[PDB]
Known about the structure:
12 copies of one chain form a homododecamer. Chain A has 162 residues and is an alpha/beta fold. Helix content of chain A is 44%, strand content 17%. Chain A has 9 helices and 6 strands. Chain A has a 6-stranded parallel beta sheet, sandwiched between helices. In chain A, β2 (32-37), α2 (47-50) and β3 form a beta-alpha-beta unit. In chain A, α4 runs parallel beside α6 and α5 packs across α8 (129-140). Chain A is globular and about 40 Å long. Chain F binds chain K through residues 13, 16-17, 19-20, 43-46, 48-49, 52, and chain K through 13, 16-17, 19-20, 43-46, 48-49, 52. The complex binds flavin mononucleotide (FMN) (3 copies). One flavin mononucleotide (FMN) sits between chains J (10-13, 38, 40-41, 88-91, 120-121) and E (69-70, 100-101, 106). Chains A, B, C, D, E, F, G, H, I, J, K, L: This is Phosphopantothenoylcysteine decarboxylase.
Amino acid sequence: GQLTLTMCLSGSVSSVAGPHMAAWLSSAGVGRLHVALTPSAQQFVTTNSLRPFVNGSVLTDETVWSAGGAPHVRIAAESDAVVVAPATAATLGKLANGICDNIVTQIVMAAECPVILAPVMNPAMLAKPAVRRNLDALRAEGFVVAEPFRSVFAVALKSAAE
Amino acid sequence: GQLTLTMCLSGSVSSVAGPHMAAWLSSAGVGRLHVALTPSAQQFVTTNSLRPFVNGSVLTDETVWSAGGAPHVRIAAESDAVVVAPATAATLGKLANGICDNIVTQIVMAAECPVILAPVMNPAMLAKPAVRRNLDALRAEGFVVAEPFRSVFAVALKSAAE
Amino acid sequence: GQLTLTMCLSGSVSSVAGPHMAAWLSSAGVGRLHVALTPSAQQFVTTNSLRPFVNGSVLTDETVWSAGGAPHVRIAAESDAVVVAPATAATLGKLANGICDNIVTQIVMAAECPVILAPVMNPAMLAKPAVRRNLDALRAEGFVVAEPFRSVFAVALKSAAE
Amino acid sequence: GQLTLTMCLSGSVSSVAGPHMAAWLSSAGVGRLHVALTPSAQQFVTTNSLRPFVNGSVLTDETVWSAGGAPHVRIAAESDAVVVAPATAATLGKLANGICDNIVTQIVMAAECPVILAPVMNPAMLAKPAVRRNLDALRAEGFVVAEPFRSVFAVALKSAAE
Amino acid sequence: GQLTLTMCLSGSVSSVAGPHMAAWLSSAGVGRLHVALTPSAQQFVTTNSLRPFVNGSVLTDETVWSAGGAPHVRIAAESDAVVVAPATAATLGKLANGICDNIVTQIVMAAECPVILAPVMNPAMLAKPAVRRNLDALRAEGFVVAEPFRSVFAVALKSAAE
Amino acid sequence: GQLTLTMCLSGSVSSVAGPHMAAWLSSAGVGRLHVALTPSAQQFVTTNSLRPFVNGSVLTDETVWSAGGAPHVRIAAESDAVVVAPATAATLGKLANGICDNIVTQIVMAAECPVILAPVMNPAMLAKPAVRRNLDALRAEGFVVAEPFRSVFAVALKSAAE
Amino acid sequence: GQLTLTMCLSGSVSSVAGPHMAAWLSSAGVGRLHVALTPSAQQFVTTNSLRPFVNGSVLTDETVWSAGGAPHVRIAAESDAVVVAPATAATLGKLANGICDNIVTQIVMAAECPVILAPVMNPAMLAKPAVRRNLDALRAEGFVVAEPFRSVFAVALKSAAE
Amino acid sequence: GQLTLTMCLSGSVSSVAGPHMAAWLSSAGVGRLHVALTPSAQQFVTTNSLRPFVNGSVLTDETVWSAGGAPHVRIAAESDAVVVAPATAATLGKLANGICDNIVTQIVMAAECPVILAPVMNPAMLAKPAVRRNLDALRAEGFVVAEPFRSVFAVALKSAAE
Amino acid sequence: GQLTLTMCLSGSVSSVAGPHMAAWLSSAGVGRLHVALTPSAQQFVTTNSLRPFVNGSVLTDETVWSAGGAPHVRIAAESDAVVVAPATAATLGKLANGICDNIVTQIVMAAECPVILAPVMNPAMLAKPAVRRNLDALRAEGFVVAEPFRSVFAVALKSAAE
Amino acid sequence: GQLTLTMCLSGSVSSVAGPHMAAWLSSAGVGRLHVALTPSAQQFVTTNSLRPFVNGSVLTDETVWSAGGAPHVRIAAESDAVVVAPATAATLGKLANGICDNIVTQIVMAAECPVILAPVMNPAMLAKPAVRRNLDALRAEGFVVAEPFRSVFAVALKSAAE
Amino acid sequence: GQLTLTMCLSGSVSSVAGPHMAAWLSSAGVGRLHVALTPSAQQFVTTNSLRPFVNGSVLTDETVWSAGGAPHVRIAAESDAVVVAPATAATLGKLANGICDNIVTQIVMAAECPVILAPVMNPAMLAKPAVRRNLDALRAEGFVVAEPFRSVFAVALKSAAE
Amino acid sequence: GQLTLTMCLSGSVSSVAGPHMAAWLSSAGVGRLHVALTPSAQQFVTTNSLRPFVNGSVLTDETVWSAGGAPHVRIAAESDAVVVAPATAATLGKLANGICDNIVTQIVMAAECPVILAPVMNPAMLAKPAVRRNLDALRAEGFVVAEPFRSVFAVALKSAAE
Ligand SMILES: Cc1cc2nc3c(=O)[nH]c(=O)nc-3n(C[C@H](O)[C@H](O)[C@H](O)COP(=O)(O)O)c2cc1C
Ligand SMILES: Cc1cc2nc3c(=O)[nH]c(=O)nc-3n(C[C@H](O)[C@H](O)[C@H](O)COP(=O)(O)O)c2cc1C
Ligand SMILES: Cc1cc2nc3c(=O)[nH]c(=O)nc-3n(C[C@H](O)[C@H](O)[C@H](O)COP(=O)(O)O)c2cc1C
């Protein structure tokens, strides 16, 4: 009802569910919804597919660049929860190592609200030691790592209540 | 099992469900799946979001132009059913009046298999006389008009059996 | 005074009068004025020539695409009258057959307010049977067809009162 | 001898015969020959392949746009016959419904001379009800529909005599 | 009747009246009409909106560059009057100081016929000392400055008689 | 506190101080701050370097063109002082001669508030007669010429009080 | 029946007959047909006009570049005859002097099968000494020079039998 | 003989040896050879220099993007060994930290076969602590790190046997 | 007086004299003057530098391509003399071997009037055997080779008299 | 011998003599020669036509922009004379009014050496009052105005001696 | 005096101080100054704003790419100190993990001189565990981390003395 | 030791050995090394792969064009030997016939030092009469033709000694 939730989409084909998830959130209590995309995510989701379901901003690296300022960092501050779903190995690896080189990773690293991450990758990657350690680091950040999607957004909304 | 189905996507935001529908069809009996997009549909679905679920071709006007030939018309001939879902007012209006100016409308007008159409538009358009008459014309073509999505593909698969 | 009027411009050289008409409307009672252009209309009118006289939006297909959403359909809903003046043979033919492939035709087909159309073409086209039938269809839509420009906007403003 | 004939080419591969037909006409009595192409026709014929055989204009949508004015409509007025050969389903459908959205359809709808049309399409389209009705409409226009190419231009030249 | 008049358009929104003025002149005695545009004027008028009313040339900086030669200077020589209407502060300032950096200013400075100028600007500029002095300089050139549009073209046509 | 100040930046390397000056003004009483750039100034300052310190608009010629309207002239009207700092020889020369060919010069010539100018150039230019006369003209305009930067903005803020 | 024939097209307007010739060959015994174009030939023939009649490859310099490898040289090796028809003066001159700077000349110089060449040029070139000598050189290569088109392809098919 | 080997090339000038190495492998027992390039590697090797020696795919980020799907991940699965040679500091650092942001790093992190890495960098980097730790991490992945090129491919082929 | 002369310019820096030579010819008896440029010549001469002195056509490869037809070959036929001055080694080599791959070489090889050539190159090229033989071939063509510029055009004008 | 001379070229067709003049200067005593072009001058002279005769820099606005710094102002300081020949009305007007908006005008206004200007324009401009006054202003600058080209460079070289 | 210092600028708005800092260094003892920018830094600083104060090179990724070679690595070797100020979270994270994917990170990782880093970020990032660990890693590299700008360059100059 | 050698690379895949050969030469006595590429060679070698091994210039047609002047001809003059290795059929054919249309062929034809050529082509071309004659012509030029690569550069270095 009174919640501002920011949804982040990574370069996984699962992010085609973005518009469906945004509608699920919109067609429920969520007051403000924001969506941010990594560059790779834009090969699987278009911003025009998200805008009809998103009463906040739909942010890409190009959108934020041409607008100037740091509107994404304002949105991080204004969020009661930030969800990265799907979260690719690459995005998890960047967050785990503090390398915020796009708008999605900058939003997460600027956020002080609960952060829920939903890793998605082939299990030929999810058991690799380097990925295990990244999940360890992400969890030391205080982030919630939901291994292995409506269940994910339920946990985010609960955390956003407090 | 032994069926070749071609799915067509129109410039409605509902066509973001394309990849989910293609996976539903793929994760079932369908043997060959093809997908064709109108130019306007590409603002809502990317071809890269469809390709992982489509063991046939993913066709756009640009894809077919640069390849040369009429591969879409070969695919129409090889199809046991053609589904347009969603079908915009514009696409319904073009088919209803024999104006096949893109690959999607050319596939439908070349097809001799069952054709199932799923109109999607605001009801401020669906009760307009011109749209009613277009649906009359589409139905005189022998096309199945499913007013007002898994139910739609079920009817297509039944017709494709005979 | 309390009226929202949307003016649509077609690919006829007569649409160079757009800015003059918008000023006439603005320099009178009209409360909100919107203007939409077909792609062909943009070879005869620039958006920058309209903006100084238009306190609402000036919409083209490119403007609406990059903005995302359906702001033109919101504007159709918010309009007390929609005027297409000039209305080319091509635009009349598309409306008459329910083929809304640009923002102007989508606005008209989404509108539930009075719609006034001002055909403009060489009389070598206006007596062609196909054009006569299109005008028949447009008039069955409930649209007001003003054969053969201030008089046109007067009729629109009267209808918008009720 | 004293005749001005305008030849129109549609997006069918048969329009590669354009240059051969223009030479046949040129290498005979025809006094002025003009040629107009639809955008789709330009994937099958180049203007440079036509110009050596055409003592009038070779018109495309881009040619006419950059030149300004309506030189194609002047050419329609100056023609003693207009031939569309090949005429695609799409072009026939547009003419049949009064939607002149390119230079070829504008020339036909502006012409007051005899108009001869040569449909070309797969018979999976030519027996479709919507195409049958379009041919009915084209023939109510007074156009000569030559179902199912030198024979076509012979009929055009006879009509141009009166 | 026997007069050649060149009309120049500046980067003021008033130059949208260009096509209407050209038709007024054309729909009267004027024998040859030419039109030239500054680059800024092209954000308010298109050349395609002028060409149907202009039996001479419609000149822009790009048109003249790609054509080569100085066709605009030939047109200045062939003119019985040159009208700049509207004349922006910038164009007045350039003429007043002999800086002909575009085709419009080159036409005026090459002309030996009567030159009529119609300043248009917000009165926050027209009382500025620098603009007053520019008008002084323009008038020392022998130009007719019509402070503060059919009346303007009437004065030009009278001067062109002698 | 209650002041609207517009800062203009010219094509001098000194305009890299723009962001620092905007922060100095912002980190003080100034209520609304606007910034406008000449095209040459954009080789030394980016708009993204200014936006974080500017609670009004950051205007370039391209920004204003694509937005349509004259938002810069609205901003001139709404300003209690306009500062050009640095002011190049070229910009001083244009203002001095009433040639407002970009957004910065248009803002100054439209402004009725105090105008403070800070010339910056090599003294091989500042003693040239033509530049001396331009400063004479600028000062006859009522502009404050601060020969030969915080001191400049102090004078502007004092004048803006009345 | 069992023959692989490669047809090469040069920058002569006669190469518009390419699609007609390819259909003649296809609508006969020829088993594999390949077509290669010089860059200049592409101003007279499009690849999309050839592809429907060509069951092998349609090769241009750009096609081969982006594909990588030397697929044209594989096709030369696999050919039972190579026909250049029309063969321009420029292409004849390059072959005659061993300068294979495009895909067409590389195919001929790599071919070990019979090579049939059909010169086409104005007789103001065909009697020039330099062209006579080039034909001498081409014929010393073992190539068949058919001075001065179905007859040409008949000779090629006979040679391909042995 | 029966082995599928994938060779990866990084942005080191040493990757100009790629084509020579691919020929060495091809001119030996290797059955299927694939090559993948990082974006930086393409300033030192062209894909056209590799294709003649590579009977599998030559993959770049652009190649895979436009093709859609994950053909590189299929190739990782089908490989009996993956060699990165040369492996830059940047590529080693990305693999070491699970950041697969290009096709080369995605292939390695998806591979379940032996992975052999050949670091190449100035020793001013190879003794840096951060690089030492990356090599530690790479070796904990089970990768073979060949400090400090035919010897490297020999070790890969031995591992691929089992 | 009654002569049509075509001047050709090659990629030598000496062709900057083109405009001066065209004026010399124009400021004398020459009735029609045409100028053609090789692509390399356009790095040393612009067409806009020639047009003011040339009452015929100024032809480049791009000019002729976009115009369609063979206007250069018409100009060759209409010429009483063709001069190539300067003539580079490359252009001499192409003519000598019948390789007319640009508009300049096509004009010469189509011309039946006297042809005068003025070689210009470093003497490190003019004594090379291959260049000597090319001059032998050019002279067997009947061309006049003026080893080693007003004197050259005098010889051309004398030959053009007969 | 020991002199550094900078030659400036304006947008007059006379600047095609630039390369000839630079060679005349080079083929004499001049030690360092620099050349600068206005943007309009580049439609009549190419930089590649000047470079072979210029042992200093050949400067355009684009050259200086991409290089950064003010190399043209360094060259002004290092010059013993600066010649503008031809000097257009526009360039004279800019210098006369202190508006150095390109590299050529910046060089002149930065120069402390003798400056020689050679006006070139149609006498329909040279007797205009505004141009007369500009020449008055140029001469008050201390510049030498050579009304109405080797004679011009002789005067410059004499002044450069002192 | 005898020192070569390389200054690196990251994608923080603080890097607009780059030109001011370079002038401070230049207007002091520093003998050679170099500046390198990350791609993101170029949205806040232009190279043209730095060049006037930098007697060495101003390096970007594009500059180094087009020049070829590794001039940045030569500059790293020639430096007595390298300062990254501001250093973003992203750049710190890359250095901390040995991922030198741009010219700035390559310069630091190649440098054997003292390296001083000035982190700049919102404290919502500087207390994140992943950033703390990166600073730990940077400091294990021997780098000087100046938490939380003239003071920073003072420490760099002291270290460069030894 | 004291030798300047220029290496030329043709459009053969063998030119990928360019960087290895340049290093072999550099890692030996050669004092100055230059490298020039044909346009086709750039699909197989990048300039950035050569620059690290080349202490002279790496020249392409685009490099030389944008630089102006004839730096390649200066390099030809300064060379003690010029090697073309590999030399394609096309490049051999051009040299053999004096057609220097790119920088590589211009360097060879300008060179007065020993010239060593290493033909590389499929033997389906090397026994063609036209290629045999080209080798005859190349050898009459005094060039050394090394039929059928370190051995080639050894012969060049021996000749360069005298
Ligand atoms: C956000 C958005 C949603 C739209 N949804 C629909 C829709 O659901 N049904 C429809 O007929 N048109 C819809 N339109 C309008 C169509 O996109 C438009 O008519 C288009 O030209 C259809 O093109 P196509 O039928 O060739 O795909 C929508 C437009 C926008 C901007
Ligand atoms: C073919 C041609 C020749 C011209 N010749 C002159 C000339 O001789 N003198 C002049 O003042 N302007 C001449 N002009 C107009 C100038 O090019 C125009 O004023 C231009 O903007 C000058 O720019 P610049 O002074 O910055 O070089 C000519 C224009 C054209 C198209
Ligand atoms: C993959 C490939 C390899 C080639 N190898 C050769 C070759 O080894 N020798 C040759 O003469 N031509 C070869 N060619 C053809 C040449 O690239 C072609 O003739 C080109 O225009 C030569 O240009 P250049 O001599 O100006 O560099 C090859 C072409 C391709 C696509």
